[PDB]
Amino acid sequence: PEPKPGDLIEIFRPFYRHWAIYVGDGYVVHLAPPAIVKKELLYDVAGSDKYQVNNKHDDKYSPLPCSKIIQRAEELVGQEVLYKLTSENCEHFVNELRYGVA
């Protein structure tokens, strides 16, 4: 089914996981290569790969208000991130947006 705005998206690319954050209307915000923060269609980001909503830490952490998640995510679009791209970094990025820093 369709993700809700603010949902973390776990993308099962062959031999590595990619993370994105759903921001609504078919769009995810995520770290990609030219690292740049991008707003793209989930359809394009997923591609032919399997993916799932994984609001992993909702059991133990409060997600931020969803309006804050989307606002913040979309604020960063266009910005380079000084750290490189691994699943852990992409995951920490989408986690920072959903839950805050901590």
For residues 47 and 67, give the distance between their C-alpha atoms in angstroms, rounded to a whole number: 27
User: Of 33, 45, 20, 29, which is closest to residue 80 (Cα–Cα)?
Assistant: 33
Resolution given for this structure, in angstroms: 2.0
Which residues make Cβ contacts (< 8 Å) with residue 92, sequence separation at least 6?
A: none
Question: Active-site positions?
Answer: 18, 30, 90
Experimental method: X-ray
Residue with tokens 């606002």: 71
Query: Which of the 8 DSSP states describes residue 63?
Result: P
Q: State the Cα angle at 45 between 55 and 4, rounded to 5°.
A: 35
Range of the domain at 76: 1-102
Burial code (b: 16+ CB inside 10 Å, e: under 16) for 19-41 equals bbbbbbeebbbbbeeebebbbbe
Give the domain CATH number at 81.
3.90.1720.10
